[PDB]
Amino acid sequence: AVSKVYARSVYDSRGNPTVEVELTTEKGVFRSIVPSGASTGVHEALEMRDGDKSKWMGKGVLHAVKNVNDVIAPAFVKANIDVSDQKAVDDFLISLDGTANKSKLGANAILGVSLAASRAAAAEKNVPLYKHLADLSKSKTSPYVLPVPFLNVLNGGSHAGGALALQEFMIAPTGAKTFAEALRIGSEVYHNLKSLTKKRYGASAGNVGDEGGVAPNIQTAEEALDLIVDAIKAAGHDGKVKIGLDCASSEFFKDGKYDLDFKNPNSDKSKWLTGPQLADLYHSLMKRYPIVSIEDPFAEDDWEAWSHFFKTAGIQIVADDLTVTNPKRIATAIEKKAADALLLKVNQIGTLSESIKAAQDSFAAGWGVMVSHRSGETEDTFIADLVVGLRTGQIKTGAPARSERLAKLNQLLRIEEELGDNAVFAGENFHHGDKL
Amino acid sequence: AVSKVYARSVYDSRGNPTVEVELTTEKGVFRSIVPSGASTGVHEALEMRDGDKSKWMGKGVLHAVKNVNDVIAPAFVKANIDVSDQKAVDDFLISLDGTANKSKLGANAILGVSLAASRAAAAEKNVPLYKHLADLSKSKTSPYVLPVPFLNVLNGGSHAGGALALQEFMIAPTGAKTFAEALRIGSEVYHNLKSLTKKRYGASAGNVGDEGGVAPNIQTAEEALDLIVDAIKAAGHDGKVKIGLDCASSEFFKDGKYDLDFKNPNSDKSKWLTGPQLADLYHSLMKRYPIVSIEDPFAEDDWEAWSHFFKTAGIQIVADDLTVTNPKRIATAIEKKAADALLLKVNQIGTLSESIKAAQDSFAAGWGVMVSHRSGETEDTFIADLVVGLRTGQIKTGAPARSERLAKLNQLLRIEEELGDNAVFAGENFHHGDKL
């Protein structure tokens, strides 16, 4: 039984405060660390920041920590909840908060307790976390599926100088036969990309962005794409490795048009593109490069560009900003045949029960699910166990650099090794790893 | 009793393979992850890499993993060693290897087992690791000392474009009264430095180097120093925060002279400096900026420049490359009054017993000890517990960015919170935190 709920402030991969919760039970102390989320709300669970400019640039989570310590803890202990009953845990928490975006208590206070309890339930059930997660979500367990990691190697957009508008360029070793093998291949291409970058753009080009990719001053998508294809060729893994794009198109959508030179700052409106001209530029790229996934190709409310595009896409289309892990937003998205894969960010919704629910509805409509990291990650490896229990077949967790990224990839190495013949790598079936 | 010793390959913060060892005992599985070290040996324990160019760019540790699995494990189990008896563990391991630089078995195979056993001993003794470490080293335990963290904020040297020869610029919040307070202050200066950098050098200037600092194209030490002082001023922590320098002077020493424009590549030999002219440039910087620590100010065998300088330094002088955590090298260094602080890199020597021994001899000569991270770190937080048990008062573990760095700073937050009034922050007494 839960005898104590405690929260403290710790730092995230960007040096910003975040919430760490500790749950005590007769089996020990279970901990969770929350990735840094949004504190101003779309259709998303809100994260609560002190706003005190004289401290941490106004990003303490001292309140959020007080909410755990002062409100949840007391109530939760007395509630005598069975941690095994996750829905009960979550329902408890949501009822305590009483708002729709966890703005009363803060999504950060709530999620920390929600995740610590699944750790506590797995201990108690005496099963590895991934297996407990498979039980909560009613996933097939024979065998388990190891995901194709979508490794960030290069960034543009709001992440760099240069005129490159698309935000992330990812590589996906679909051709490997094991997770260990895909991770080794992925690191060699990455290491090769770094060499070429330092070579063609200079030593400063070697520095990494928040998630581990390089961010040289590149001018076009083709330029960036060409560099990655060269790196694939040089690591000698030509044909085994694919590309994934995160366009973050919400960033350059203005006036019902898309500005590919949004860092302009003298961008010719004669040159902005409509949904359909943009669809045309992606078709082009798609014919020339091994792209198998495009994330947020159109803006978060540009429903008709999604649908139109989606009709002839023929590759995996991931909704991230369009759906914001919101089931009302997921249902429309499905209804409209806007995409076929959901980017799941557990902290965009704030609770493990609602995260699982959002994956299940996706799966029921034939969508795939890409589990994802946040910009501000921690040393917590929870998403490694979740992507395995959800059986999704694909995770987006950073470049094979910075341990907030590698902690998760190391954890999948370990689970893989532990499952023996009870594990299969999703490979080329990443889209539908759930149906393998 | 140790019932099983197992090793696997996992990745380090740079995406390169490294060794993870698991030790099983009747209390559970204790794990350790080794930072990436040297595989070609100075006067240092050698790290063993497969050299197979067709795999991980020739950096697998598959052999090293075989050494654990195939040689140590079998032998160690049968030896029936008491993990509590650390010296016995280490002596066991060294005897198994039989070379002076752990080149038989690989320092990476050996250290992993050496550290897993101290974890196992602490479990068994039912004490926190830091307390077990305090027992092995016979450190005062009342109260414990929390260190001043030396945070890397900016890099030059072999780490950047620009003509700046000095390698690392660190900030040290000596004026804080708690570790939690020093870490918050340190992050605000850091965040402020990032803003200024992006401002004055452009968006690419915002990308971080291996350890978390920025690496803009700076021309001189003064330029870099001025930027940090501005950042200190803007975070509003003027006077509470000091600067630490790592010159890595071995990198620009040529012909018995020091080339401050070593990226030249047309560097005027008319302009190289002798020991004594270099001593003069540091004296200058020291008068103008709040510098309290200089690391490797002269080259690793330039004994007379060290001594001369050391005579009038009046600040902490850290030997890193000069001593390479080697006690024969430490004794000369002491004998010669070359410096007064040792940079301790547990993996430069390969064993916890020898690491502690090297700190004790330093302390006996009145030197201070700065515990340090490696370029290629992991998610393992062992150095957080070590700096507390050794009672050194100062640790060098990266910028407050990248979780291979923050994992250790988060761990010190936790220990601090746990010690209650039994902990003091070394503050301004960082040099001698051992004597507090």
Closest CA–CA distance from residue A323 to any residue of chain B (Å): 29
The Cα–Cα gap between B143 and B347 comes to 28
In chain A, whose CA is at the least distance from the CA of B195? Answer: A57
Contacts of B409 (CB under 8 A, 6+ apart): A11, B149, B183, B384, B397, B400
Residue A54 neighbours by CB distance under 10 Å = 10
Structure tokens at A268: 């010719």
A428 annotated active-site? no
The Cα–Cα gap between A231 and A246 comes to 19
Contacts of A109 (CB under 8 A, 6+ apart): A7, A19, A48, A64, A65, A67, A68, A72
CA A128 to chain centre: 22
Using the structure block, give the residue that is written with the tokens 């790196």: A231
Contacts of B430 (CB under 8 A, 6+ apart): B147, B148, B172, B174, B368, B393, B394
The Cα–Cα gap between A204 and A130 comes to 40
Q: Cβ separation of B15 and A410 shorter than 8 Å?
A: no
* Claim to verify: residue B238 and residue B340 sit in the same structural domain: yes
Cα dist from A364 to A143, A306, A357, A396, A435, whole Å: 20, 20, 11, 22, 11
Q: Where are the alpha helices (DSSP H) in B140-218?
A: 179-201
**How many angstroms is the resolution?**
2.2
Breaks in chain B, named by the residue before each, with C–N above 2.5 Å? none
The Cα–Cα gap between A404 and A18 comes to 14
* Claim to verify: residue B70 and residue B204 sit in the same structural domain: no
- CA neighbours closer than 13 Å in the CB half-sphere of residue B345: 29
Strand partners, B291: B243
Residue B140 neighbours by CB distance under 10 Å = 12
Report yes or no: A211 and A375 within 8 Å, Cβ to Cβ: yes
Q: Which domain holds residue A144?
A: 127-436
Strand boundaries in A257-322, DSSP class E: 257-258, 291-295, 316-319
Q: Exactly one of A44, A47, A188, A211 is catalytic; name it.
A: A211
Q: Does B204 touch chain A (CB under 8 A)?
A: yes
Q: Does A326 touch chain B (CB under 8 A)?
A: no
The Cα–Cα gap between A399 and A187 comes to 8
The Cα–Cα gap between A247 and A253 comes to 11
Q: Which residue type does B136 have?
A: L
Q: Which residue type does B102 have?
A: K
The Cα–Cα gap between A160 and B424 comes to 43
Q: Phi then psi for B338, rounded to 5 degrees?
A: -85, -30
Q: Does B29 touch chain A (CB under 8 A)?
A: no
The Cα–Cα gap between B165 and A333 comes to 55
Closest CA–CA distance from residue B126 to any residue of chain A (Å): 14
Identify the residue among A403, A404, A409 best suited for mutation to test binding to B, counting B beta carbons within 10 A and taking the highest: A403
* Claim to verify: residue A119 and residue A47 sit in the same structural domain: yes
Question: Could you give the number of structural domains in chain A?
Answer: 2
Q: Which residue type does B196 have?
A: L
Q: Which of B15, B161, B402 sits opposite A13 (nearest CB)?
A: B402
Report yes or no: A425 and A417 within 8 Å, Cβ to Cβ: no
Nearest to B392 by CA among B354, B431, B353: B431
The Cα–Cα gap between B309 and B279 comes to 6
Chain A residues whose beta carbon lies within 8 Å of the beta carbon of residue B413? 8-10
Q: Does B379 touch chain A (CB under 8 A)?
A: yes
Cα dist from A331 to A349, A363, A364, whole Å: 15, 12, 11
Closest CA–CA distance from residue A188 to any residue of chain B (Å): 6
* C-alpha distance across the termini of chain A, in Å: 37
Q: Does B11 touch chain A (CB under 8 A)?
A: yes
* Claim to verify: residue A151 and residue A290 sit in the same structural domain: yes
Contacts of A270 (CB under 8 A, 6+ apart): none
Nearest to A207 by CA among B204, B189, B361, B91: B204
Identify the residue among A8, A410, A411, A417 best suited for mutation to test binding to B, counting B beta carbons within 10 A and taking the highest: A410
Q: Phi then psi for A216, rounded to 5 degrees?
A: -70, 170
* Claim to verify: residue A189 and residue A92 sit in the same structural domain: no
Pair type for strands A291-295 and A144-146: unpaired
Q: Cβ separation of A13 and B217 shorter than 8 Å?
A: no
Question: What's the CATH number where A322 sits?
Answer: 3.20.20.120
Domain limit, last residue, from A92, A126, A160? A126
Q: Which of A8, A11, A202 sits opposite B409 (nearest CB)?
A: A11
**Is the CA virtual torsion A13, A15, A18, A23 positive or negative?**
positive
* Claim to verify: residue B179 and residue B117 sit in the same structural domain: no
Question: What's the CATH number where B14 sits?
Answer: 3.30.390.10
Strand boundaries in A105-252, DSSP class E: 144-146, 148-155, 168-172, 242-246
Domain limit, last residue, from A126, A155, A171? A126
Report yes or no: A397 and A408 within 8 Å, Cβ to Cβ: yes
In chain B, whose CA is at the least distance from the CA of A213? Answer: B207
The catalytic residues of B are 211, 345
* Claim to verify: residue A246 and residue A289 sit in the same structural domain: yes
Q: Which helix (H) or strand (E) holds B342?
A: strand B341-344
Structure tokens at B215: 């690496």
* Claim to verify: residue A405 and residue A381 sit in the same structural domain: yes
Strand partners, B190: none
Cα dist from A69 to A5, A19, A74, whole Å: 7, 11, 8
In chain B, whose CA is at the least distance from the CA of A21? Answer: B414
Domain limit, last residue, from A79, A106, A126? A126
Q: Does B57 touch chain A (CB under 8 A)?
A: yes
Report yes or no: A193 and A133 within 8 Å, Cβ to Cβ: no
Tell me the residue length of chain A.
436
Q: Does A182 touch chain B (CB under 8 A)?
A: no
Q: Which of A9, A377, A402 sits opposite B13 (nearest CB)?
A: A402
Q: Does A8 touch chain B (CB under 8 A)?
A: yes
Strand partners, A18: A10
A336 CB burial (10 A radius; 0-12, 13-18, 19+):
middle
Q: Phi then psi for A292, rounded to 5 degrees?
A: -115, -5
Q: b/e per residue, A1-39, with b = 16+ CB within 10 A?
A: ebeebbbbbbbbbbbbbbbbbbbbbeeeebbbbbbbbbb
Q: Is B166 helix (H, G, I), strand (E, B) or coil?
A: coil
Report yes or no: B374 and B345 within 8 Å, Cβ to Cβ: yes
Closest CA–CA distance from residue B357 to any residue of chain A (Å): 30
Instruction: Cite the annotated binding site of A by residue number.
Output: 159, 168, 246, 295, 320, 372-375, 396
The Cα–Cα gap between A350 and A348 comes to 6
Tell me the residue length of chain B.
436
Pair type for strands A168-172 and A148-155: antiparallel
Q: Does B55 touch chain A (CB under 8 A)?
A: yes
In chain B, whose CA is at the least distance from the CA of A209? Answer: B207
Closest CA–CA distance from residue A368 to any residue of chain B (Å): 28
Q: Cβ separation of A56 and B187 shorter than 8 Å?
A: yes
Report yes or no: B377 and B187 within 8 Å, Cβ to Cβ: no
Q: Which of B183, B400, B407 sits opposite A379 (nearest CB)?
A: B407
Residue B15 neighbours by CB distance under 10 Å = 26
* Claim to verify: residue B108 and residue B153 sit in the same structural domain: no
Contacts of B102 (CB under 8 A, 6+ apart): B45, B46, B94, B110, B350
- DSSP state, residue B240: T
CB pairs under 8 A between A and B: 136
The Cα–Cα gap between B420 and A123 comes to 29
Contacts of A72 (CB under 8 A, 6+ apart): A5, A93, A96, A105, A109, A110, A113
Q: Cβ separation of B8 and A414 shorter than 8 Å?
A: yes
Give the method used: X-ray
* Claim to verify: residue B229 and residue B86 sit in the same structural domain: no
Residue B375 is labelled as binding a ligand = yes
The Cα–Cα gap between A215 and B264 comes to 26
* Claim to verify: residue A232 and residue A350 sit in the same structural domain: yes
Q: Does A413 touch chain B (CB under 8 A)?
A: yes
Helices A382-390 and A403-419, axial angle in degrees (round to 10)? 50
The Cα–Cα gap between A311 and A307 comes to 6
3-state secondary structure A236-267: CCCCCCEEEEECCHHHHEECCEECCCCCCCCC
* Claim to verify: residue A197 and residue A286 sit in the same structural domain: yes
